[PDB]
Amino acid sequence: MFFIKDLSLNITLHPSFFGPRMKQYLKTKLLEEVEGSCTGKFGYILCVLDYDNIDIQRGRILPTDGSAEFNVKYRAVVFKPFKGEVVDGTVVSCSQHGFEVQVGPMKVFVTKHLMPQDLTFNAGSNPPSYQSSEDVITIKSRIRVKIEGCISQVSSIHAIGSIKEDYLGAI
Amino acid sequence: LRMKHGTYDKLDDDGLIAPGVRVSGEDVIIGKTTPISPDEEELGQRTAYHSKRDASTPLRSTENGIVDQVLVTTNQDGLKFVKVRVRTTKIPQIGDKFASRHGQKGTIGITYRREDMPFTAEGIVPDLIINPHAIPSRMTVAHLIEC
Amino acid sequence: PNLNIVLTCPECKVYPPKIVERFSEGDVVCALCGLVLSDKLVDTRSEWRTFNPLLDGNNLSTRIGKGETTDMRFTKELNKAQGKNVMDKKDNEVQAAFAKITMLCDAAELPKIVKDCAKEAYKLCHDEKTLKGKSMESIMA
Amino acid sequence: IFVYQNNITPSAMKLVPSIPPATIETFNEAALVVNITHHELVPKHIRLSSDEKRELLKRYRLKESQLPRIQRADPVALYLGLKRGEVVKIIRKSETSGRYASYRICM
Amino acid sequence: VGQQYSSAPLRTVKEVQFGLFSPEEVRAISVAKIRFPETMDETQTRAKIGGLNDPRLGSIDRNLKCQTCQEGMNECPGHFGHIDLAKPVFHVGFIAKIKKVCECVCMHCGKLLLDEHNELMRQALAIKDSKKRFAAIWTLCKTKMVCETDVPSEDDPTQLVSRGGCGNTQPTIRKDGLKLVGSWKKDRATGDADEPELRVLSTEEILNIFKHISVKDFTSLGFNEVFSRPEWMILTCLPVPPPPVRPSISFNESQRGEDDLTFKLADILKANISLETLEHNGAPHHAIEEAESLLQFHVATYMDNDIAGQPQALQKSGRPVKSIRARLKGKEGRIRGNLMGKRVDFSARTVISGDPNLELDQVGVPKSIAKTLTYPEVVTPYNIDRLTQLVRNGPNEHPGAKYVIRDSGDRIDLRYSKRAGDIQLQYGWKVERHIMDNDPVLFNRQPSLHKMSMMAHRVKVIPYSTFRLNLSVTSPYNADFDGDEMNLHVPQSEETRAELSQLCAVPLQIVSPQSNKPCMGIVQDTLCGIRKLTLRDTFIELDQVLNMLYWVPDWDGVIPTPAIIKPKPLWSGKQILSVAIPNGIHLQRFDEGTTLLSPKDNGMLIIDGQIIFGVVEKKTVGSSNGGLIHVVTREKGPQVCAKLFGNIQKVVNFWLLHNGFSTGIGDTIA
Amino acid sequence: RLKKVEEEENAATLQLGQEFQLKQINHQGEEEELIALNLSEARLVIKEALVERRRAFKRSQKKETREKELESIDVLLEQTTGGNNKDLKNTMQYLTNFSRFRDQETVGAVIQLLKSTGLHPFEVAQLGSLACDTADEAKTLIPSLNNKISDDELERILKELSNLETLY
Amino acid sequence: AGRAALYKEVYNVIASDGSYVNYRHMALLVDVMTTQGGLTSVTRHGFNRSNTGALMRCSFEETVEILFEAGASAELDDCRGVSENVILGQMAPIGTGAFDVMIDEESLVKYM
Amino acid sequence: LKEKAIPKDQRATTPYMTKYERARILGTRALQISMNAPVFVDLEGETDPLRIAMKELAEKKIPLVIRRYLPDGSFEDWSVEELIVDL
Amino acid sequence: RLVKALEDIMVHYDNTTRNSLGNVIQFIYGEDGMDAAHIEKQSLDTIGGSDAAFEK
Amino acid sequence: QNAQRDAVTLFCCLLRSRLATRRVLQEYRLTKQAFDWVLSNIEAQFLRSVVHPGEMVGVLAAQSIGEPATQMTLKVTSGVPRLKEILNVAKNMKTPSLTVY
Amino acid sequence: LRFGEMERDCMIAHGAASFLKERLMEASDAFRVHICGICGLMTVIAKLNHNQFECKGCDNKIDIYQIHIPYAAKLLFQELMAMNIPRLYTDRSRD
Ligand SMILES: [Mg+2]
Ligand SMILES: [Zn+2]
Ligand SMILES: [Zn+2]
C-alpha cells in the first residue's frame, strides 16, 4: 500500500537545453515523469518527497548524441498492491458478470464465480448491483473488498477481488 | 506483375526491338510472361495484368548505344529463342589503361590541344608524351631502339 | 488471420494507391504525395543468378555417394544403405517410371519438353483403379 | 641446502617436503659449476619484504594477479630460494633510460 | 522509417555469459511444436501448413505475421519453436569431454573416483585456473579401474572408513565412430577371470548417471551449476532456428527456393517420426538400433559436417550439404567476412592521375561521384539561406540536394517532388546534399600495411571523371599510376567528421611514427628539376622570375633585390627559391668538402630562411633523418609545411616547363 | 540466476514480498530498513510535500481542509502535469475518506505511543491502514490479527488508539 | 636473460636487411610474448589457450572448438576489448574512447 | 562503494589536455552550434560550426568539464578552463 | 597472425602498458615515456676521445 | 619519485655533457636572455614530447614490425623461414650454432 | 565496397572509434531488438502498438531493454542458440 522508499531514477535531456537555469528544469522534468506513473515493481507512484536538497550532482554526455543523462536519487510516496487485504474502496462502473471497484489506482473486478450466492443479486438494476442488506453501489459505493491478488502484467494492471468472507462486502 | 520503369515504347508487336534505334541504360529490350497454367492463371491473387510475373531484361544501366541486327531462331528442342546485339562507340577518355610493347602501362593525365602542344620546326605535333623516369629504372632500351 | 499486408499511402487514399518501386534504391513511394512507404527491398533476380520438384512431388529426392575426404569402407555401407528408405515412399516407383520414360524418350531421341510432359502425364494420375497395373509399361507408352 | 653427486631416488624425494616450516633444497654440482648471475645477460635481482609488496600493491592499485609472473622452477628462482607469494624487483640496463624498474611475482 | 519508437529503456552491452540450455527452459521459450516435415501449399495451394515455415513464428516475406507480433520483416528478430525426440543423442561438440568425464566418474554409483583422501588430488582440487584442475583429475582417474566403497586406509593411522557408494568397476572405454563402448573386466570370479563384455553405452544410462552427480562434484569438475550441468550437455529436446537464418530465396520463376538448413531439418523430422513409429509398433530389435544410430548420425551431420571422415553425408546434388562449421569457418565464414569486416555504404572506387597544382590536404573528386554521394546536415539559423538555395537548386545542379528529413522519421525524396519550390525548411531538420568543396573525407588504398594509406583530405571538385591527388604523398601510398584503384568513405555525423579532420589529415601525419624519420617527400621530377635549378652556373631573367613570384600564393608583394645588376637584372635559382622557403630556418650539412668556400659544391647551409650556397639534392631536401621537412615541421608548426610542399612544387614545375629536360641513347653510348 | 523462483504467497501473516524485504542497504552505505506508512499519516505527509513544491514553484517564477484539498491539488497537478491523474485524485480520495483520523495530532500521538511500545512495523502499519474499533471482529476478519497478537493486549492498545481518532 | 637473448636474435634477423625500426616496438613484442613466466608462441594453441577473453580467442580461426569449450565452461568476458565492442557495435574505450565526457551545471552557470 | 571518486586536489594526471579529448570537445561544440545552443564568444560573421568551436576554445570560455578514468574504476574530474590548450 | 597477437595493448592514464584485463607489460612504456615521433639519431658527447682530450 | 628520477638518466647525462660550463662559454657565447630562452624552449618541447595517453601502441608496433617482412631474401638459415621459426617456436632449431669466447 | 580486416586495424591505430561505430552501424544493419536479461535471451515479443512486452519462458514484465546491434551479431546469436549455447546481461556485476 501507501509506502515510502528511496528511489534512484535516471533521466536524459536534449542538448539544446544547456541554458544556465537547467537544474530547476530538471526538477520540473522529474515532476512530470514521476507523477502519474504505475510500475510493476512498486505499483503506482503517487508523488515526490523532499523537494529541496535533491541530488543530481553530475551528468554524462552520450558519445553519439548531444543528449546528456542524469540519475536522480529521491524519496517518494508509492502505492504497493498486495494479496489478501480488506479495503473499503469505491465502485464507479459495473458489469453484468460483476462490478468493477476502483480502489485507488486499480480497477479491482470480481468475476461471476467469486460473488457469494447468498447475496440476492438482481439483474434489473442500473448499474447491476449485488445487494443483500446494505452493500449497494452508490455515488459513495464504499464496499469492503479484499484484493487476494493484484495481477501485474504488461502495463495494464488489474487486481482480482472477492467478498466471499463474513462482513466482507457489507459495510 | 511488378512492372519496371523501363518506358516500354521501344518494343514492337513481336515483343522485340527493331534494330538501329538508340537505347539508354535502363531500357527494356525483351518481354516475358509466366505460362502457369495451372496456378489460377489470370484471376487469382493478382489484377489483370494477366499472367506476367514479368522478367523482362533491361540493358546494363550505364552503357548506351545503338541496337543492331536482332536475330531469332528456335533452340535445340524447338522454342522461341532470342539473341540481340547492341553497338556502342567508345571514344578514348582520361581513364584508359595504355601500355607499350615493353610494359609501360598507366593512364592518361589530360589532353590539351595544338595551340600549346610542344612543336618542332616542321611542326610535327606529338601524339603522346610520357615521363623520362620510366627509362633508367625499368631499363628498357628496346623501346628507344624501336623508335 | 487473413494473412494480408496491404500497402496504402496514409495521406492520399485515392485508391489502392498508384505507387512505384525504385529498385535502384530498393524503396517504394506513393507517386502522388512523394512520401516513402517502406525501405530495404529484397532482390528478385540475384537468387536466380546465384544458383524437377513438381514431378518429384512434395517429398524431395536425394542421391547419395562418395567424396574425397571420406572412406571407402563406409561409403560402400552408404551405397548399400541408400536403398533402406526407398520402400517408405512410392517415389522410388515414380522415379523408376521417370528413369524408364527417360530411357524411352531419349531412345527415340525425344527432347526435354517431351520427357517432362510424359513425366507430367504419369504424375497426373499415377494411381487409379482404372490404371490397375496393366503391365506397368502400357501406362508409360 | 643439499648437494648430490648424481641422481636421487624418489623414495628420498617423497620425504623431502617433510618437517614444515623447515624447507629442503637440492642442487647439482654441474648445475652450480658457474655462477649464473655473473653472466652479463641476466640483470640484477633483489628480494622484497611483504611490507614493501603491500606498499607496491596499494600504490599502483593492482590486485595481485595482473602483475607478471616468474616460474618456481626457474634457475634464478632456485638461486634465490624464494617460494610462492614473494615479489622480485628486477633492474636491467635499459637502452633508453639505463636503469629501469620492473616487478615479478613468484608462481 | 521511424523504426516504431517505444518506451524500452535503451542501454548498452557490458557483459556476456555463455552456457548451455536446459530442455525445460528451451521448451518454455518455444512457441512452435512442429510435426509436419513438409511446409508449403496445404492441399496444395498456398499459405504454408501448421508444421514448419511460420504457423506461429517469424514471418516469411512482406507479411504481417511474425506470430502476430506485427513487426513485418525488418523489425521481427525471429521467433522460436522446438521439436521433440524419441531418445536422447550425443553431441559432436562435446564427444571428447564426454569420454573424459565418463572415464572420470563411476557409472552405477554416481560418485567421483577420488574424494579428498589422496593429498595429490587434494592439491589438484586446490589448484584452480578453470581446467588444469580438470586435466589433473582426468590423468589421475585413468587407473584404479574399480569403484570402491571403502578405499581410505591412510586417512587414519591404519584404519578404514566408508567413503564410496558401489563396489562395481568402470569399463575400459574405447571411442568408436559415433558412439561409445565399454568392456568391464571386473575380474570377480575365483580365478583372474579376464572376461570383458563390450556393451553399447546407452545415452539414457549416461544421462541418468549424470543426473546422479553432486553439485560440489560439478564445481570440482569445472561445471558451473547455474549454467552448465552435463545432462544439458546430452541432447534431448532440440530447438529450431527461425525463418531468417534459413530463408527461402524465392527462386525467381516458380520456386520459393528452400535452402540447406530447412532441408536438413526436414530430414531430421522425417527420421525422428520413422524411429518413433518403429519403436511404437513391433520392434524386431535389429532395425531399431541402426535407426537410432541414423538419428544420432543425422543430428550430428546437421550439427557439423567437418567430422572425422568416416562419413561424408551429402545431399543432392553432388555439392556437399553445408553445415555450420562451414557456415562459420575462416575466409568469410560469417565472422571475419561479416563482423571484423563487411560491406559498407558511401563508397567510391576509380583510378587516379597526378597533378602538380593541388596541395596535400585537397583531393580531386569527380562530379558524377559528387552527385551520387551525400552528407547529412542540420538546420540552424546560420545555414538556413544557403541550404534553402541548395534545395531550390534541385537534385541535379552540382551543389545539389537529394533528401530532406523533418522532425519525425521523414524521408521525402526530391526527384519526383511535384511541390518542388514550396518547402519552407523549418529548424531542427536534416537535409541531404551533395559534396560541396573542402569537406573532410577519409581515404583508403588496398592493401594497407601500416599507419599510412589512411589520409584525410579536403576536396576541390573536378570534372572529367577520375580522381586527382598530390604527387607528394604517392610513395607512402605505395602506388604508382599503373591502374591501381582507390577506396573512399564519407562520415555522417559531426563527431566523426571532426575526429577525421583533427587526426587523420596529412599535416600531422608528415613523420611516420613507425620509422622515427619523416616518410613524406618531394619526389622524382621536381627533385630532378630542383637539382637543375640549384646549380651555381645557371641564372634567370625578369619574365621568368616575375611569373614565379606571382606563382607563389603567399608572396608578400615585395620583389627580391637583383642579385647581379650591371647590364641586366638577374637572379639565381637559389635566390628565387629563398622566397619560397619560409623564414627563420637553419640547416647544416658539412660533408667531405664544405670548407665554407665549397669547391666541390657539396653541403647545404641556410640562414634566416634564405639559401646561401649549395646544391639541393635528395640527401638534404628529400626524406632524411636531418630532413628540411623534419626541421620545419618540428619547429614552425605542422601545417605550414603543407604550403611549403605547395610552394616549391609549383615553382619547380613552372620553371621546369620553360626549361625542358630529357635523356636518350646519347647518354648511354660512350 | 537459475530463474530465481522463490515462490512466496503474499499475506498479512508475515508472508512478505519478494522485493519489499525488511533489510536493505542505502546509497550512503548504511542499512535501510523497510518503511511502511499508514493511510492517515500518508494523507497527512503528502500535503507537506504538496505545499512545499507549490511554494517552490512560486519561488521559481519569483526567480484537515480536505474539501479544499481535493480541488486544490487538482488545480496544482493540472497546472504542472496533465489531467490524466484522475486515478491520483481517486487514490488521494481513498487516502482522505477512509483514514482513521482526520487530524494530524492524534496520529502523531499514536506514533509517539508506538515509538515507545516498539510493535511490529508491518502489523501496526496494517492496523493504521485499516479502520476498525473492536479487536475480536478485527481478528475474525483478518487471520493475521487472529494469530499474531493476543486479543487482550490488542484491545488495550486499540482503545487508546481509537479514543483519539475521529469517529465516522 | 631469455627475453634479452630473444630480442637480440630477432634484432639480428630483421637488421640483416631493411633496417630499421625503433627499439620500443620490438621490445614490447618480445616482452609481451615472454610475460607469462615462460615462452609462448603466438599460434592457434599457444597464446590463445590462456585466461583471455573468448571473443578475441575466437577471432583466430579455432572457432567451433573454442566456442564449444567456452559454452561448456560458461565464463564471462568483460567486453573491454576492441573485438567485443566492435562486434557488439559500441565504441571501444580506446583512443578517443579511453575517457568520458561530463556536463557541469555549475561550470555552465559560472561561465554563463 | 567508497564513493568511487577523488577530490580535485592531489590529481596525478597530466595538466596538459591532449589530442583525443581535443577532438571530442571540438566535435561536441560543433554539435551545440549544430542545434543552436547559445554561443559565448561573439560572432564575426562566420557560420562554420568548427570555426566557432575553434574560436571559443582559443578565447577559453567553453562551459564544459572532462572526466578521466583509471584502471580501478575511480575517476578524476577536470574543467576545460583549468586545462591549458598547448599541444 | 602477429596483428592478431597484439590487439588490446592500451596505454592507460598512468603511463603503464596493460591489456584489456590489465596485465601490465611495461611499467613505464618503452622505459622512457617518449613517443614514436620526437626521435633523432643524435650523439652523446662523452664516451669518445681520450681521458686526456675529455678533461681537455 | 625513484622511477621519475630514474627514467630520464640518459637525457640528464646528455644534457649535462652538452651544457657543461666550459664548453658553452668557450664556443656558444650566450646572453642571459638567450640562456633563459633556450632553457624554457627545451622544457616546453620536452613536455610536448611525452607519450600521449590512449595510443594503440601495440597495434602500431605490430604494423611497424609487419611492414618490412615483405622485402626479404629467400650456410645459416636467414630470411622468412628463420623468422617464422624464431617467432613460432617449434622446439626445433635447424641451426644449432653456439658462440664461445 | 569491401571493408577489410587490415582496414579495421589501421582505423584502430588512428583511434577514430566513434567513426568506426557509426560506419559499422549506419552503413550496415542498424538493428533494434528487445531482450530480457533475467532470461539473458533473445525471445521477448513486443506488441509495440499497445506497449506490451511479455516474456514467455520468464513471465516478467519489468526486465525490458532495447539495444542497438548487428543483424550480423543476431545471425551469430540465433544461430548459436540453435547450436546449444549465450546469456546477454545489461550491466557490470563484478568491479
Ligand atoms: Mg580474458
Ligand atoms: Zn501519397
Ligand atoms: Zn514477429
Ligand SMILES: [Zn+2]
Ligand atoms: Zn562407483
Ligand SMILES: [Zn+2]
Ligand atoms: Zn525473461
